[PDB]
């Protein structure tokens, strides 16, 4: 008459000693607790110690630090320098720690409009080279996830991370869905201003539908993480992109980056480069070490 139904946490090979991990300064705050920024020994191979960052759970429920656990272990599948990181687990005890890669320039989003002018002298806004650095360890990032058989199905900028030196990797899953809120619409709570028109009209999902999300995400960079159709509502933005409607050519905007745009905007998926492809229009022009850390040019891209 039936099959049970009870969710769990198996600990593993990621099981890290509480012992090993200190905390310090508050990043802010999760759907399942505070998180923190500290140091962990141990965690990287030839790092005796660590700068992490702390994801934590003793008032939650075991509902609740189960299904916490889960989630985020979904990160362990991944090994790519431009992804972001699980370091380990102290599920042993309370409270409950998810260690993670410490990005200390926080998500791409909140990073793109810190380098908007305040209202004193200011550092000009990103070169053409910096920009495409940018799209280039995303669009990284991505097909190794594509390789990996993942659809990602949220790629936008506040879903990107950037590190001390600046790069910039696929964000820990599902960390600025509920903080950056106005970016959905529910029609489930879908990123509608990010969204292909395919996945608009039948709610599916594919890596071409992930490229065209990353030319919104190029189309963010360039406007220092404006509202992708500003003007229009969640409704119009609907119709709009189903209808073949595309967002403009930002302003000073370099014309090659607003063409890497064009080919990811593509009305037919088809004809929609793969993030592989879209490196290797690139390639030349990302910094050296490119070639050492990225998965373009690992043994892994066959
Ligand atoms: C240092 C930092 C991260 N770094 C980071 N690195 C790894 C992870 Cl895994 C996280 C993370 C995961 N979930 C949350 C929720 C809130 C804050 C940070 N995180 N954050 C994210 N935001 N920030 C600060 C940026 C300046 N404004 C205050 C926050």
Same mark, same amino acid.
């Given at each position: 008459? #039936?099959?049970?139904? @009870?969710?769990?946490? /198996?600990? %593993? &090979?990621? $099981? ?5 991990? *200190? ?12 998180? #923190?920024?500290?140091? @962990?020994?141990?965690? /990287?191979? %030839? &790092?005796? $110690? ?5 994801? *934590? ?246």
């Amino acid at each position: 008459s #039936y099959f049970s139904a @009870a969710d769990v946490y /198996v600990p %593993d &090979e990621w $099981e890290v000693a509480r012992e090993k991990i *200190t905390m310090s300064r508050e990043l802010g705050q999760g759907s399942f607790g505070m998180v #923190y920024e500290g140091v @962990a020994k141990g965690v /990287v191979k %030839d &790092e005796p $110690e660590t700068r992490v960052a702390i994801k *934590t759970v003793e008032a939650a429920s075991m509902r609740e630090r189960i299904e916490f656990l889960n989630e985020a272990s979904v990160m362990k599948e991944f090994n790519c320098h431009h992804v972001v990181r699980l370091l380990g687990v102290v599920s042993q005890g309370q409270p409950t720690l998810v260690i993670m890669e410490l990005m200390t320039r926080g998500d791409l989003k909140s990073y793109l409009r810190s380098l908007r002018p305040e209202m004193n002298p200011v550092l000009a806004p990103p070169s053409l080279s910096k920009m495409i650095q940018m799209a280039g360890e995303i669009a990284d990032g991505m097909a190794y996830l594509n390789a990996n058989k993942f659809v990602h199905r949220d790629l936008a900028a506040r879903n990107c991370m950037v590190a001390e030196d600046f790069t910039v990797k696929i964000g820990d899953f599902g960390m600025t869905r509920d903080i950056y809120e106005t970016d959905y619409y529910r029609k489930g709570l879908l990123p509608v201003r990010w969204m292909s028109p395919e996945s608009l009209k039948d709610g599916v999902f594919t890596t071409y539908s992930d490229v065209w999300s990353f030319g919104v995400v190029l189309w963010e960079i360039a406007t220092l993480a404006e509202q992708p159709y500003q003007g229009l509502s969640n409704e119009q933005v609907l119709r709009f992109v189903m209808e073949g409607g595309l967002l403009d050519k930002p302003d000073n905007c370099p014309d090659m980056l607003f063409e890497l745009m064009r080919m990811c905007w593509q009305y037919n998926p088809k004809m929609r480069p793969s993030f592989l492809e879209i490196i290797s229009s690139i390639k030349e022009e990302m910094e050296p070490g490119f070639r050492e850390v990225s998965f373009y040019y690992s043994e892994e891209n066959k």
